[PDB]
Design a protein around this ligand. Structure first.
Ligand SMILES: O=C1c2ccccc2C(=O)c2c1cc(S(=O)(=O)Nc1ccc(C(F)(F)F)cc1)c(O)c2O
Ligand SMILES: [Cl-]
Lengths: 233, 234
């Protein structure tokens, strides 16, 4: 059976993972970096070998990948980065903590957003402190108008992640390349939902742990032959 | 000029401190070499440099140099391409030996012949060499054909396998308008510099590229330098 490993990055600076970090390019905190080290060491202890790596264009994921590759002595592997594996774009909520979000929008609406599969947050407007920082970042300069989000529902996030999965990652897996993916909660949710055929409600209830290698064994049709497995202790 | 190319040679490795021939052995940076890379990266950051694509070898002292620079200039998101063709020169049977061991075994005379030669290789790395399986059987070279995987290299050999990557993969990116950064090794970079400047064999053998410092070329549309290489920093 094919083997696929996913890893979700850990903690980012300034408590940004509890502040809808989204497309803001927050770095790992020292603790998130250590999480990645422990994941890498788990993969090393278990003797894992990869042939190709995929990650987003966000430095907290990239640095997670770097840390893992360092730990397993496979810094020489080919690495492919794509905005399509980015975290969900949280629009105008980006950077806000829970209290600020509730104060600005009300508990009713926040409940609706938190439980909805295809309702996006409000768009990130020009007066948002991250607006030019993100929308005019030259790493997205080749994106067309529809491609560069101002906000995303979970449905949107999964919709732009899965074409990369199908077009770039799947052919590698079917060639027998051992794939490592270092990415984010919601883009990885897209992949997991596709792999396991999960419902919208199920994927919204699924919370992937951070810094832990997530192992899939896939058959010839890229269907898991058993539940996802975690490496470490 | 039309194009800008930046080269960087990695700094001190753990085996440099041991005075040992590394070649294709995958020695890591020393702390000092890592700091060198940080200073180079900061020089590129201070000068506002932007890149569109990066090339490096499959050796971690170069790769980690690249990572350090990308971190410093906040461009960790750039596409990166790794290739064995940018590896350090393969030092064959000398690999793993220090200065003393090499002179003791071969004589400073024979070492004279090797280091002053453009096209005399060191002896081959044989199956009984202590690093033979560590290097020759490393799965990162699994796709090399039999003729491609060196047992040893003269500088001529090194340049001969580096320049095809330059011509076939890097040049087209430059003419596409991509701003290229190459993080690699003394001898593979020598290959590139020799091609760019049309240098003689003796000239390239007398050229010693400084480490950890961004090397800037301004190139015309035919990739001819319009002025000498420049070093970035203070
Ligand atoms: O209010 C929202 C929300 C609002 C608008 C668009 C999208 C969402 C949204 O997607 C969301 C929300 C709240 C929770 S929650 O409380 O149940 N866990 C959570 C997750 C992340 C954050 C963070 F602020 F750090 F991003 C906060 C809370 C979610 O899980 C969640 O996905
Ligand atoms: Cl990389």
């Amino acid at each position: 059976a094919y083997k696929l490993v996913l890893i979700r990055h850990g903690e980012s600076a300034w408590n940004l993972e509890n502040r809808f970090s989204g497309w803001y390019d927050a770095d790992l905190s020292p603790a998130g970096h250590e999480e990645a080290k422990r994941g890498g060491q788990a993969l090393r202890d278990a003797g894992y070998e990869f042939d190709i790596c995929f990650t987003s264009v966000q430095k907290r994921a990239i640095r997670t990948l770097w840390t893992v590759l360092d730990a397993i002595d496979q810094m020489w592997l080919p690495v492919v980065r794509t905005w399509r594996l980015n975290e969900r774009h949280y629009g105008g909520l980006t950077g806000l903590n829970k209290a600020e979000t509730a104060a600005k929008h009300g508990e009713a609406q926040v409940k609706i957003w938190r439980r909805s599969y295809d309702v996006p947050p409000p768009p990130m407007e020009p007066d948002h402190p991250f607006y030019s920082n993100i929308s005019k970042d030259r790493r997205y300069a080749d994106l067309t108008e529809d491609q560069l989000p101002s906000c995303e529902s979970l449905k949107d996030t999964i919709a732009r992640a899965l074409p990369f999965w199908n077009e770039e990652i799947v052919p590698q897996i079917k060639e027998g390349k051992r794939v490592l993916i270092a990415a984010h909660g919601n883009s990885l949710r897209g992949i997991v939902k596709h792999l396991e055929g999960l419902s919208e409600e199920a994927i919204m209830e699924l919370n992937l742990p951070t810094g832990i290698p997530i192992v899939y064994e896939l058959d010839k049709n890229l269907k898991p032959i058993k539940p996802m497995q975690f490496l470490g202790d």
